[PDB]
Amino acid sequence: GYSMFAVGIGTLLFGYWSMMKWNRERRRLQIEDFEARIALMPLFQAEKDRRVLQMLRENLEEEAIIMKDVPDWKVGESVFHTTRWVTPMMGELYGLRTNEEILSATYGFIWYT
Amino acid sequence: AGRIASFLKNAWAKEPVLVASFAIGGLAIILPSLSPYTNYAIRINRATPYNYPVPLRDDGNMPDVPSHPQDPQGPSLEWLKNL
Amino acid sequence: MFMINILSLIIPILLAVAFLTLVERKVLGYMQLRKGPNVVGPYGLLQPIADALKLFTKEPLRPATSSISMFIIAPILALSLALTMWVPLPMPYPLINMNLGVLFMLAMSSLAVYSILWSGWASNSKYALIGALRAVAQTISYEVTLAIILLSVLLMNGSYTLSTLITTQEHIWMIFTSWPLAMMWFISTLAETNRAPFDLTEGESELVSGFNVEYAAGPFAMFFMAEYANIIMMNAFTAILFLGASHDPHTPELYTINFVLKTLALTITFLWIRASYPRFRYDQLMHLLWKSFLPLTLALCMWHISLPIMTASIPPQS
Amino acid sequence: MWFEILPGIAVMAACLFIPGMATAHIHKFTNGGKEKRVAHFSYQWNLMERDRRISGVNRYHVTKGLENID
Amino acid sequence: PGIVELPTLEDLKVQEVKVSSSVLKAAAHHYGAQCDKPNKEFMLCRWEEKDPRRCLEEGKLVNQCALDFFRQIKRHCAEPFTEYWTCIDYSGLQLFRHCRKQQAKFDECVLDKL
Amino acid sequence: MPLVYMNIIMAFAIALAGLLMYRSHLMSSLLCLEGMMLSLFIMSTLIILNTHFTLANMMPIILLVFAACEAALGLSLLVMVSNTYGTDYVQNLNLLQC
Amino acid sequence: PFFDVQKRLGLDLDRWMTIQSAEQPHKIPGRCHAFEKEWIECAHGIGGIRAEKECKIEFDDFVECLLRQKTMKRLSAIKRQRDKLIKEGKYTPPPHHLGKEDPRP
Amino acid sequence: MTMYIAFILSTIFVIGFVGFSSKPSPIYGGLGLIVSGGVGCGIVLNFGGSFLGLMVFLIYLGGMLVVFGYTTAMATEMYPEVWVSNKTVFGAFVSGLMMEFCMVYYALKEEEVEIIFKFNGLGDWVIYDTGDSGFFSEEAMGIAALYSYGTWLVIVTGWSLLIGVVVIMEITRGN
Amino acid sequence: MNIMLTLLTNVTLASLLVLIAFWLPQLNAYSEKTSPYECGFDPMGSARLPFSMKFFLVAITFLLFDLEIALLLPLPWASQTNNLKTMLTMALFLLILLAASLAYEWTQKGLEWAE
Numbered sequence A: 001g002y003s004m005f006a007v008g009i010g011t012l013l014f015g016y017w018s019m020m021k022w023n024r025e026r027r028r029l030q031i032e033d034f035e036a037r038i039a040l041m042p043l044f045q046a047e048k049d050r051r052v053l054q055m056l057r058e059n060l061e062e063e064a065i066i067m068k069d070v071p072d073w074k075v076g077e078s079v080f081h082t083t084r085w086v087t088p089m090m091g092e093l094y095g096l097r098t099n100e101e102i103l104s105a106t107y108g109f110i111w112y113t
Numbered sequence B: 001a002g003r004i005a006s007f008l009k010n011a012w013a014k015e016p017v018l019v020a021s022f023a024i025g026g027l028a029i030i031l032p033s034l035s036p037y038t039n040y041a042i043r044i045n046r047a048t049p050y051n052y053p054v055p056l057r058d059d060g061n062m063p064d065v066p067s068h069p070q071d072p073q074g075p076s077l078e079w080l081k082n083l
Numbered sequence C: 001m002f003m004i005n006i007l008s009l010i011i012p013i014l015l016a017v018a019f020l021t022l023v024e025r026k027v028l029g030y031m032q033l034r035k036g037p038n039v040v041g042p043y044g045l046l047q048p049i050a051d052a053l054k055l056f057t058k059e060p061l062r063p064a065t066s067s068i069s070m071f072i073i074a075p076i077l078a079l080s081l082a083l084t085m086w087v088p089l090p091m092p093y094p095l096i097n098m099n100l101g102v103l104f105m106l107a108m109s110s111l112a113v114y115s116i117l118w119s120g121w122a123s124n125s126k127y128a129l130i131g132a133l134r135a136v137a138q139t140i141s142y143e144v145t146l147a148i149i150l151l152s153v154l155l156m157n158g159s160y161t162l163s164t165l166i167t168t169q170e171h172i173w174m175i176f177t178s179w180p181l182a183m184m185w186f187i188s189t190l191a192e193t194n195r196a197p198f199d200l201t202e203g204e205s206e207l208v209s210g211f212n213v214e215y216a217a218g219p220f221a222m223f224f225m226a227e228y229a230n231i232i233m234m235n236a237f238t239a240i241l242f243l244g245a246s247h248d249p250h251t252p253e254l255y256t257i258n259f260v261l262k263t264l265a266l267t268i269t270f271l272w273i274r275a276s277y278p279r280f281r282y283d284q285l286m287h288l289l290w291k292s293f294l295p296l297t298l299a300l301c302m303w304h305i306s307l308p309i310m311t312a313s314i315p316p317q318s
Numbered sequence D: 001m002w003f004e005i006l007p008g009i010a011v012m013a014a015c016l017f018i019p020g021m022a023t024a025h026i027h028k029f030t031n032g033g034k035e036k037r038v039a040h041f042s043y044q045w046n047l048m049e050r051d052r053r054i055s056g057v058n059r060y061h062v063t064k065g066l067e068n069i070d
Numbered sequence E: 001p002g003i004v005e006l007p008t009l010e011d012l013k014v015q016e017v018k019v020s021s022s023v024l025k026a027a028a029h030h031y032g033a034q035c036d037k038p039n040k041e042f043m044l045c046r047w048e049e050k051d052p053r054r055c056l057e058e059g060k061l062v063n064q065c066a067l068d069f070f071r072q073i074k075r076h077c078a079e080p081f082t083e084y085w086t087c088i089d090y091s092g093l094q095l096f097r098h099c100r101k102q103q104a105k106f107d108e109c110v111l112d113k114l
Numbered sequence F: 001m002p003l004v005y006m007n008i009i010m011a012f013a014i015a016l017a018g019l020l021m022y023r024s025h026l027m028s029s030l031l032c033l034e035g036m037m038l039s040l041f042i043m044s045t046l047i048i049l050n051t052h053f054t055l056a057n058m059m060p061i062i063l064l065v066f067a068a069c070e071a072a073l074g075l076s077l078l079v080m081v082s083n084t085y086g087t088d089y090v091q092n093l094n095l096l097q098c
Numbered sequence G: 001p002f003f004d005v006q007k008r009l010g011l012d013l014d015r016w017m018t019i020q021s022a023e024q025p026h027k028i029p030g031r032c033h034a035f036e037k038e039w040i041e042c043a044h045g046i047g048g049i050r051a052e053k054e055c056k057i058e059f060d061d062f063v064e065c066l067l068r069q070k071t072m073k074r075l076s077a078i079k080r081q082r083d084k085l086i087k088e089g090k091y092t093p094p095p096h097h098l099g100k101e102d103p104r105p
Numbered sequence H: 001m002t003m004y005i006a007f008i009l010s011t012i013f014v015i016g017f018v019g020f021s022s023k024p025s026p027i028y029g030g031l032g033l034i035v036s037g038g039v040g041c042g043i044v045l046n047f048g049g050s051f052l053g054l055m056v057f058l059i060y061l062g063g064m065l066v067v068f069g070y071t072t073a074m075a076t077e078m079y080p081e082v083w084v085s086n087k088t089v090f091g092a093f094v095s096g097l098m099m100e101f102c103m104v105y106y107a108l109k110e111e112e113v114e115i116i117f118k119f120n121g122l123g124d125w126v127i128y129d130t131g132d133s134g135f136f137s138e139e140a141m142g143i144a145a146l147y148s149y150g151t152w153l154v155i156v157t158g159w160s161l162l163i164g165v166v167v168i169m170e171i172t173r174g175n
Numbered sequence I: 001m002n003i004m005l006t007l008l009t010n011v012t013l014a015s016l017l018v019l020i021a022f023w024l025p026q027l028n029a030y031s032e033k034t035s036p037y038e039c040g041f042d043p044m045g046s047a048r049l050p051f052s053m054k055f056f057l058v059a060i061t062f063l064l065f066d067l068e069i070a071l072l073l074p075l076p077w078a079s080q081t082n083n084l085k086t087m088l089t090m091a092l093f094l095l096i097l098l099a100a101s102l103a104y105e106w107t108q109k110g111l112e113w114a115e
């Protein structure tokens, strides 16, 4: 019985040592690719800003055209009392677009498998 | 001393599963407080940059904040590479 | 092109089940100093085809006292879930890549039990009811232990993603770090698939045919297909979880071959186990899971929570 | 025998080889020949969506190198 | 409640960076080393202003710095870099680890030329 | 509001009505109680995910824990009622009046 | 009725989870973090009776961020007018709203 | 608008609720509640709640298995009732079905305040957030926070579970 | 969307197998053939009579131990936090009360089946 238990515990200790080294290396690798993401984030933020603002401007121009006949409609009138920037709702950005873009924007990531 | 000896003897003879279970549970409870690497695990968790490090507005009174990543100030992960 | 992949996954799995029937008959034969099927086709190769054709050209009967709707729904559920349980398995790439693949496997398995329960109840026969209640008891017996064992083993992996298990084991099999949990997990998969010595629900000696005694022809063949598919699926999962095969990104066929060999070894081990042992009484199985496996499993869960912290070995991907 | 059990085992092994090999080949065929992209988190999905937009053919797999920045 | 002011589509134009995510990931470390100044200026603007409309010029400087960086890379060694980002691009997770020879060659290239 | 929210609130109302109007079996009422909990879990989860309240992601789990305790409590009482009468019928429990 | 043991002992048994603007893991913000921050700072220390009248603007903005009732109304109005003008052929939608845009990074 | 998948899923949710609230045999009540749990898993999955959806599905599967055992043990009758074997069960089922129908019609073709407030529809996709960041799942982070932020919650729930075991032992003792 | 197609395909295949099984073979159904099986003879009572459950107490306990699993599944993510001493203390505390509730029901003869 001693020999069996000893072989078992030795096997476990070898496995623990190996996994310790391997998981430390994996954590270093994760830090490295996280830092790549960090170095890349400003460019993504800049172009995301420009993309959002361009979609909002296009919607604003199309809404100036569409809502000219209705009598008392301010084009581009906010629904908030505050004057600070509000992150656009998904519907506002893609409100006047095709169902394929709306589907890709709402459920594209959830459904990707 | 001799009461618990024969007690653990009878337990190892009658219920080795419960003996091993209580041994493993007790080890799991007490060993983490005696380890020098628990702090290493806390530090490893703290060194993982999940979100963007927002820069600080320099006011001329920050001698210990880097002005470029490769500058010598700021935290170092050298201890981690040799770990 | 995705439906091509779905069919590519499913058609082969059903063929592998068909020929697992033959392999089991021959392995049990040779362990019993006989041969098993060697007449229908060279080396009994055509025996599964004859069995399938014989079953789907025989008259299916609906019992007079049975609830027809659940009677017919139960085998559909069984076979469709048996096929569904394969889609997140990374071989080395999965058909469906999930973040929580292990937990999806748990939920689908837990839903699989209802088909046995419903079929027994729908039948409105005494032996079918006894088989169904044995199934209730079996789930109560192994469900808590099986989940906590997965949790304990998965702590080293860092997530519930099945494809991460390949990276976790690039240098060593995870059985060298958790062979006690591996033993208890193997026995829990024996109980979870209703296999000897834990196959109480069928109860062939005791209850003649258990839950499916009423079932005939095609509906019966569907229950059989589902069970054997589950036997291969569990073993494949066991292989991925404890014996990770080295994966080369530019040559995944090597991983596929290694993985298939390991799952075949585990399946043949099930057949061996069936050839070797007497059947457990159903009350005894509950005692075995609740008085021996659950204390050790709780202690080993504590140990596997404490160990990566003690040793600064915690895995990536919160 | 015992080696007469091996033909059925070989047929079963050939049937089990198919799903993984088919998934690998179909992934490579429908992802530009380079191992279908994994998006477990929304940052990877954003990378894929940006890649789809800049390709010009509405396919994420097509990759634009330094030959696209004049 | 007041009209929302938006930039015109003319002020939103810029010379885009039209390289894919594998190229960006292969260059990311040196790109974060070299273009740190405008990127940090832009992120400080962005996080103090809390308005994307107030940090357009910083974003355009970000684009121009990235384009200058990539132009230097193209001018001094496109071939080691292409090797490296092709290796990176094959991977479905785009893992840095499977490409260490190509990364080593690219790193020696930039260290000696620039 | 959204159509999905309306449907979940309707599910709660239907289960509540089911609990209120008894038939013969107690187990059916116990099921209705479980149904109410299920709809509460779904509703709270939808609200929490939508508003991105991160720390509130744990409260539906607590909800499930307590729901399990309530379910266990209900089944114990059913065991005792059935042992007394050989049946889980509501009509049997009429010993005490107002 | 309410014995404030937390405030007397300075414990924080459940106050960490009461609002959306309070110290989330990894600094993940709530969808309506700024609106709630504003409504909380506007009404702090003035009592319940004054806060309902004097901070109604911040609270109305907060509720609009939460449920977005006015935004959906405005979008519905715009799309109904678009449907009406398109049916008669008076208005033609732009190409970048039909799937033929020049996408940008 | 887009495919109205979640609307179909929530309607099937309501239908399963009508199924088990009609108070037919428990074998069919548990079936209805299993269907509801599965489609609610799907509903939550479509909003980014993978863990919570899969978890509620798992929990309710276990619960309904226990309930099936208890139904055969104590809820049996010579002729268990289905939705069409009884005027009372069938009437409740039909009334629930067409009540859901009336609510859905009145809500989607015009804009009425049923009880709490009103709604026009538009599909669920409009209220999303278009947020772009992260190497993690925010749901998983908020749920993992139970062990660092939610110490008090862990304490009270663990105590209640231990007390629940003690309580069922006390109730089922007899004497 | 791919998982929905997969589930649809699997359910459709199984339903088509059932359809073939019921519409291809010759059917000769009579009352003797369709009667309940009880090994040669007619059943005495109904199979819908109450069937006593002797493990009724372990079944209720399973409901409470199954929810312990919902509280323990986030543990791989909880390990990534910075205050590991609080996380470990809490995780250990949770499993200890789970072991104590098992020890309570075990010592009070709650795991023995009714006789």
Ligand SMILES: CCCCCCCCCCCCCCCCC[C@@H](O)O[C@H](CO[C@H](O)CCCCCCCCCCCCCCC)COP(=O)(O)OCC[N+](C)(C)C
Pocket (backbone or CB within 6 Å): G012, G013, H148, H149, H151, H152, H155, H159, I083, I085, I086, I089, I090, I093
């Ligand atoms: C006055 C009477 C005292 C004794 C009787 C009290 C009866 C109630 C039981 C215990 C009272 C609760 C006290 C603990 C409240 C938890 C919060 C506090 O302790 O801080 C925690 C400290 O954690 C410690 O581990 C305390 C928990 C230890 C308690 C375990 C056992 C105690 C309960 C025993 C009785 C319960 C029922 C019976 C079961 C045996 C977390 O601090 P920290 O993580 O730094 O920072 C959090 C902020 N972050 C997230 C931004 C970083």
Ligand SMILES: CCCCCCCCCCCCCCCCC[C@@H](O)O[C@H](CO[C@H](O)CCCCCCCCCCCCCCC)COP(=O)(O)OCC[N+](C)(C)C
Pocket (backbone or CB within 6 Å): I013, I016, I017, I019, I020, I023, I024, I025, I026, I027
């Ligand atoms: C692997 C899964 C997919 C496999 C792929 C194949 C899919 C197979 C689908 C399952 C059906 C196949 C079953 C095989 C036998 C056919 C069963 C049935 O459809 O045939 C008869 C259907 O016939 C009907 O009884 C009435 C005949 C005509 C009905 C009119 C329908 C409208 C058609 C108008 C006629 C004009 C020409 C139509 C063509 C354009 C039923 O007669 P019945 O005797 O009871 O059943 C016993 C069948 N036996 C004899 C073989 C044992």
Ligand SMILES: CCCCCCCC/C=C\CCCCCCCC(=O)O[C@H](COC(=O)CCCCCCC/C=C/CCCCCCCC)COP(=O)(O)OCCN
Pocket (backbone or CB within 6 Å): B011, B014, B015, B018, B019, B021, B022, B023, B024, B025, B026, B029, C291, C294, C295, C296, C298, C299, I096, I099, I100, I102, I103, I106, I107
């Ligand atoms: C501080 C550690 C805590 C965490 C670890 C534990 C986690 C999980 C393990 C505990 C699970 C609950 C255990 C429940 C105990 C039940 C006791 C009992 O009544 O069973 C006895 C059997 O056990 C006993 O004999 C009673 C207690 C005897 C001692 C058991 C172990 C006590 C501790 C032993 C080891 C001490 C510490 C380890 C040191 C190792 C040496 C270095 C009766 O057996 P039956 O099933 O009824 O037999 C029926 C047929 N005749």
Ligand SMILES: CCCCCCCC/C=C\CCCCCCCC(=O)O[C@H](COC(=O)CCCCCCC/C=C/CCCCCCCC)COP(=O)(O)OCCN
Pocket (backbone or CB within 6 Å): A008, A009, A012, B014, B015, B017, B020, B024, C180, C181, C182, C183, C184, C186, C187, C197, C238, C242, C273, C288, C292, C293, C296, C303
């Ligand atoms: C330095 C820190 C290390 C921490 C500790 C780690 C070392 C742990 C050492 C002990 C490990 C033991 C793990 C075993 C778990 C269960 C053992 C057990 O006791 O179970 C048996 C019962 O278990 C069985 O015998 C199994 C029954 C079914 C057998 C099925 C086939 C046999 C197994 C075939 C080979 C198994 C291969 C498993 C792994 C496969 C690869 C994945 C108890 O039952 P009884 O003897 O009746 O006593 C109860 C009353 N006192």
